[PDB]
Structures are given as structure tokens and as C-alpha cells.
């Protein structure tokens, strides 16, 4: 064999060089750093009004406005400081699994299992929220949708592909391929120039927005991936999976840095998020509790117990003044 | 201490809460039925007969039914079935015409899920105009050596039906509702209505403790 042999010997020698040049693990370097202690977070406020499971939730850029996607087909924009419902957008499809909040704050988006996170415009001269564009072209169910700008959105679906769109035209500028299983999560970099995507094929991979090529791929996993997020400097990311483990990779060293698992944990992870300073890692499990993981020590520094069902979506403010956690019990909770 | 504006914000929030409650109350009066089955198993024929993801809405005897067909998803990774909790039931379809073994495997998969323990399942064998003509070519032994019953329509059909029923690994919670009457007549609609009615009554009773 020549193509099989070439592929095998390549993969082998790249991985061997990566292992050899590896110096130490993240925990090995931060041993002299002390734990953060018990991160006791009380529910300062609770958002009520959803009448079904919560699948997704995204913070605004001003750190005061929320948006949450729910199984009942309602996208609600909250005012966190007062628990006011600023907007109530009736979605066309009741099967929603992800969304985002435009950085400018002008736009919010989605659809659902119809393979679209359709876009809504907030600041309209009619005073209501209207559907601006519907980005069609994906074939599999839709796993994420994140804004690069007010006129550029990147999307991840179950077709093993991610697409970069031009909202005004509505045509997918570029389409990304390489996955073999359903793509479940993507995270946009701070500079909106790169992003990482995770898929059911047990492999996360970094995809560039401009060239359209696959800059990198990540492996070292057992089961499918459900959640992914960048370290706040955009120089790393963490993953979450049904294996009941969360993994932190570095897109430069190409090697998995740390593992986030404990024996008592037997169920998967549905969402992941980071602290403003990237010192606390937040993951929403199926065990009805959300664990606060010290990203450098991997110990459980706290638990956001108080959810009566699966914790599906997390979030953090841009200023880090709070944490929003969603679950299937239809209640969002802002913690601090 | 509220300003003249924050009070109007609170009034907006209260109005939105009123709208949310009045729409959720409507959303809780609708029967949700997940539809499953293999290719050419009457799924399309059933959705036509019955009064990305595809939704079909119909009203029968004052009930609002939502039947969700998820046959478009070409990935076999069960990453959205858990979103179908709370559905009143399921409608799994199979055709007498080794397709039968694949259908049995899928039926076992749907019954054995942790997500559908409390949800009845409605197995359908609706068509009865082509289910007898082909029985005479060979008995139920092309891939099923065990069967040694009479090579007649009723006997073989009942044997297949009982073999499907036996797949239920826990009969305590759920129940399988079966149908064999011809698809031509408008009985397939009535059967699902009786099944959902029974499931609704049992859900109500199990809430009090009577069950």
C-alpha cells in the first residue's frame, strides 16, 4: 500500500514528534499555584417565563442583556439587572438547539432542526423584532451559530460541515469540510479570525475563516463532542463530550493539555464556558448540577447546584459580573 | 425606588409574561407524536393518510395533533431524539413485505431508550391489500427458521405481531398499541386517537397516584 502507508506513517511521525517535543502537562507547571477555593455562587436572580426545556443561551456585549432559546419556540431577551423581558420573539420552529447575540447588539438569530439559525433584527423602526434573513444550505441538524460581525456569521451543523455566510447576500461565502461525524459546537475567537469546531467523530478541528482551509485537527477522544469554547485570549479551547470528560487543547502545541473528569461523574457534558480571566471553567452536565472547574488545577472549585434537570447551556458576562446557567427545568439563573 | 421609566419596563415585562402564559397554555393542549420507521415502511403513506425535521398539524375530535417526521436526518447518531421527550406517544411503522429484521432492531432501539420509558408506542401494520398475495411464495422461513405455524395470513401475521410485542423489555410502564385493519379505510386516524386518549387518561391517573 502507498496511500494508506503514507497516511499512517505521516500521522505516526507527526504525533511522535509532538509527543517528543512535549515538555510537561498544564497541571505539572501550575503546581506552585494555589487553588481558588470554594466558588460559592448564590442565585442573585432567577429568570422565569420559559415553559419548556432550555437548550441554549447567549450573553450580550454590554453584559446586561440575555437571550435564551427554549424548546417551546420562544426566544426571550432579558434584562439581567431587573429580570425584565425586553423582547419575546416567537420562533418559526420549536426545535432550537443553539444561538448567539450579535456583538453590536442589533441582531439575534435562529431557526432549528430545520438546519438554520435564522437572523432577527432588533432595532427596527416598527419597534418589534423581525426576521432579517434565513441562511439555508446546511443539510444536517444545526448545532451552533455565532456572529463574526453584523454581516458575517459562521455556522455548524450535523452534516459534518461548517459554513461561513454573508448575511446581506444570504449565500454561504465558504463551506468547510473534513468532519466524518455530526458537528456539535463551535467557538468564535476573540478577533473573529479563526474558530474551532467539535464533532461526533471524537475530533475537534480549527478552521480558518478567510482561506477556507482546515488549519488544524484535534483528536485524543473516545466519544462524541457536545461543547467547545475558547480560552479568553483565543490561544486555547476546552471541549465537552458524552464521555463525561472535558478536555483542554492548545491550537499551537497541537497536543491535548489537560483532562477534566472525576470518577463520580458518569454522564456527559452539554455546555462549556470560561471566566473572564480564564481562571474558572464552567460545564453543564446531565447530573442536574453545573461544576465550576479550575481550568489550571482541574479540581471542582464549586458547584452551581439548584437546577432540577439537565444543565444545557451556560454563559458569562463580558465583564465577568455574573454567570447564567440554563437547564431542562425551564428556568434560567444568574449567579454571583 | 423606581423611576417613571422603569415602571413602564416592568409593565412591559408583565405584559410579556401574560403573553408567555397564554401561549404556553395553548402549547400544553397539543398532542405531540413522534413518527419513526424504516424506508418504504408506510411513513410517507401514513402521513398522507393521517388527517430537516417536518411537521404535520391536524385536528381530530377536538384534539390538536403535532406529528413530527424526522426521516430527513441522514445521520444515525440519535443526537435529537432526546429533544422528543414528553411526546404523548410514538408511531413506529413496519411493512409485512431482511427488512423485517431491520425494523425489529429499530423497534427494540426505540423501546429500550432511556428517553421513551414512559411513552407508549403505536406499531402500525395498516396496509392489508398486498399483505396476503405474497405469503404463498415462501413461508416465514426465508430468514426465520423458528416459525413452524400454519402458512395462512392470520397465523403468520399474528406470529409477527407477537414477536414484535415480545421486544418490550419492560411492560410495566408503557404499552404497545397495534393495528392490522386495512389502510384504505379511515380507521388509522381513529386508532391513534383511541391510543392517545388512553395514554392521556393513564398519564392523568398516574399523576394522582391512582395508577
Amino acid at each position, epitope marked *: 500500500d502507498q496511500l494508506r502507508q503514507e497516511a499512517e506513517q505521516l500521522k505516526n511521525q507527526i504525533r511522535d514528534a509532538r509527543k517528543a517535543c512535549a515538555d510537561a502537562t498544564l497541571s505539572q507547571i501550575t503546581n506552585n499555584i494555589d487553588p481558588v477555593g470554594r466558588i460559592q455562587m448564590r442565585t442573585r436572580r432567577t429568570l422565569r417565563g420559559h415553559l419548556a426545556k432550555i437548550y441554549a443561551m447567549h450573553w450580550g456585549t454590554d453584559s446586561r442583556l440575555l437571550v435564551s432559546a427554549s424548546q417551546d419556540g420562544k426566544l426571550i431577551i432579558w*434584562d439581567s439587572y*431587573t429580570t*425584565n423581558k425586553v423582547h419575546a420573539i416567537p420562533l418559526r420552529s420549536s426545535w432550537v438547539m443553539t444561538c448567539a447575540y450579535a456583538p453590536s447588539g442589533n441582531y439575534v438569530a435562529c431557526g432549528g432542526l430545520d438546519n438554520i439559525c435564522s437572523i432577527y433584527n432588533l432595532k427596527t423602526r*416598527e419597534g418589534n423584532v423581525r426576521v432579517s434573513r434565513e441562511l439555508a444550505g446546511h443539510t444536517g441538524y444545526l448545532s451552533c451559530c455565532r456572529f463574526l460581525d453584523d454581516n458575517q456569521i459562521v455556522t455548524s451543523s450535523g452534516d459534518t460541515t461548517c459554513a461561513l455566510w454573508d448575511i446581506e447576500t444570504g449565500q454561504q461565502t465558504t463551506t468547510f469540510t473534513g468532519h466524518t461525524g455530526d458537528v456539535m459546537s463551535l467557538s468564535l475567537a476573540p478577533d473573529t479570525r479563526l474558530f474551532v469546531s467539535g464533532a461526533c467523530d471524537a475530533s475537534a478541528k480549527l478552521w480558518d475563516v478567510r482561506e477556507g482551509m482546515c488549519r488544524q485537527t484535534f483528536t485524543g477522544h473516545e466519544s462524541d463532542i457536545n461543547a467547545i469554547c475558547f480560552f479568553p485570549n483565543g490561544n486555547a479551547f476546552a471541549t465537552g463530550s458524552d464521555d463525561a470528560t472535558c478536555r483542554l487543547f492548545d491550537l499551537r502545541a497541537d497536543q491535548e493539555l489537560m483532562t477534566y473528569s472525576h470518577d463520580n461523574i458518569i454522564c456527559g457534558i452539554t455546555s462549556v464556558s470560561f471566566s473572564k480571566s480564564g481562571r474558572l471553567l464552567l460545564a453543564g452536565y446531565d447530573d442536574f448540577n453545573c461544576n465550576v472547574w479550575d481550568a489550571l488545577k482541574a479540581d471542582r472549585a464549586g458547584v452551581l447546584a439548584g437546577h432540577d434537570n439537565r444543565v444545557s447551556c451556560l454563559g458569562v458576562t463580558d465583564d465577568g459580573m455574573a454567570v447564567a446557567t440554563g437547564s431542562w427545568d425551564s428556568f434560567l439563573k444568574i449567579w454571583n | 425606588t423606581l423611576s*417613571a421609566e422603569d415602571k*413602564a419596563a416592568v*409593565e412591559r415585562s408583565k405584559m410579556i409574561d401574560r403573553n408567555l402564559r397564554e401561549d404556553g397554555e395553548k402549547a400544553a393542549r397539543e398532542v405531540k407524536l413522534l413518527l419513526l420507521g424504516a424506508g418504504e415502511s408506510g411513513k410517507s403513506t401514513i402521513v398522507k393518510q393521517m388527517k430537516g425535521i417536518v411537521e404535520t398539524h391536524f385536528t381530530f375530535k377536538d384534539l390538536h395533533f403535532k406529528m413530527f417526521d424526522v426521516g430527513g436526518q441522514r445521520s444515525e447518531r440519535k443526537k435529537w431524539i432526546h429533544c422528543f421527550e414528553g411526546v404523548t406517544a410514538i408511531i413506529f411503522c413496519v411493512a409485512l413485505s431482511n427488512r423485517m429484521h431491520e425494523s425489529m432492531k429499530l423497534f427494540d432501539s426505540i423501546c429500550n431508550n432511556k428517553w421513551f420509558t414512559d411513552t407508549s408506542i403505536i406499531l402500525f401494520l395498516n396496509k392489508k391489500d398486498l399483505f396476503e398475495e405474497k405469503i404463498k411464495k415462501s413461508p416465514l422461513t426465508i430468514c426465520y427458521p423458528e416459525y413452524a405455524g400454519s402458512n395462512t395470513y392470520e397465523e403468520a401475521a399474528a406470529y409477527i405481531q407477537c414477536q414484535f410485542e415480545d421486544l418490550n423489555k419492560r411492560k410495566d410502564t408503557k404499552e404497545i398499541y397495534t393495528h392490522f385493519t386495512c389502510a384504505t379505510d379511515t380507521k388509522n386516524v381513529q386508532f391513534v386517537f383511541d391510543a392517545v386518549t388512553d395514554v392521556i387518561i393513564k398519564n392523568n391517573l398516574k399523576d394522582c397516584g391512582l395508577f
Partner: single-chain antibody
Amino acid sequence: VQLVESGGGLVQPGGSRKLSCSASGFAFSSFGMHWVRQAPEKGLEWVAYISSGSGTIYYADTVKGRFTISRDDPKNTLFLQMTSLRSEDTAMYYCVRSIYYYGSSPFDFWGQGTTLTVSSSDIVMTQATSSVPVTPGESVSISCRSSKSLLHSNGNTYLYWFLQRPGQSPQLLIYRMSNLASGVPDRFSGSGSGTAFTLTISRLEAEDVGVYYCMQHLEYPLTFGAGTKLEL
């Protein structure tokens, strides 16, 4: 967005009429309505208010209990029924829309007004002057003072800036402080602190001539200023 009123004219003292305001071009049901009036070449004066859904109704101390504000969401129309008119009730009545939610501009749009003629505690804001000659390109600064401090505990200084051009109804420029509205050139700006407030304009143009009004929304009833003019 089009707010058009009607129902004005002439009326003797002690008579009754009904003003009407027809709104079209936006979600009227989600918008609360204000009523404002302006006496002949004297200035503005707030009148009434009805919140979204008819949940709250206020009135001006001048006409509280005499007058009424009515809503009809299905027909997208607004009413102001007037019971008994004194000789002071001559003025040009405006129809103003308002929606309150975090970040909103609650006085974005004004109507074209209507005229009514009759035969012959509260926060007080005073405007420094009523006329100021200036030429284009030479910066100006309009200002007015207030009795109380409009800075609420929310951190919001509920002071607005409307500019009434000759022969045209007022127009929002600033809705809390420096928060430029929709369709307004970026040259305008607003600033102040507690009681002293100023509106600044750089590189003035031919369309900046008119009367400037500063309105307060911290507590009801709302109160306008005398009105500062720019001479050209």
C-alpha cells in the same frame, strides 16, 4: 412611522371636543402614547400619558380630572377627549410615541400636531435665554437649569433635547445624555451634571435654526422649558 392627528379647530369656553391621533407604520400596541401641547409662541407643556396596554394613565396637574386619554389597539388610534375648556386651553397639541425598555429611546418620534383655539412641588426648569445670534461654522451651546437632580439611582439622567424647526413639529436629538437618536446628524451632542445641562452643536447648518426645548422625565408631571432660539 407616521403619527397624524386631527380634530382641532375653534371652540368656545365650556365646550367639549375629541382629539384623535392615528398611528401607522409601527407596532402601536407595544408603544405608549404621550400628549404634549404648545401655546402660541410661548413654549411647550406636557399634557398626559397612557402606557402600553392601558395599564397606567397619568394627567397634567393643570387638567387632571378634566380631560381623558383613551386607547384603541385593534384600530391603531389614540384619543384625547376634552371636557371643559378655559381661555388658556388654546395651543397646538402634539401626539408622541414612547416605548420603555433598557436602551430604548422613549421619545423617538413626534407627530405633526393639531391646533385648538378658545375665545377669550413639580420640577421647574429655566432656560438661560430665548435667542442667540450665530453664523454657520461657529459652535454654539444651548443650556437650561433644573430644580431637582434628574440623575436617578439607575444612573440615568432623564433629560431630553427636542428641536422645533420653523413650521415643523419637534424632533428628538438626545434621549438621555449625548445618546443621539435615529436620523440625527452626529454633530449634535448633549451633556450636563445634575442640575446644569447644555446642548452643543459643531459646524452648524441651515437646518439648525428653530427653538430648543429641554424636557425632564424623572417624575410626573413632565415639564418643558421656556425655549431657546437660534438667530440667523
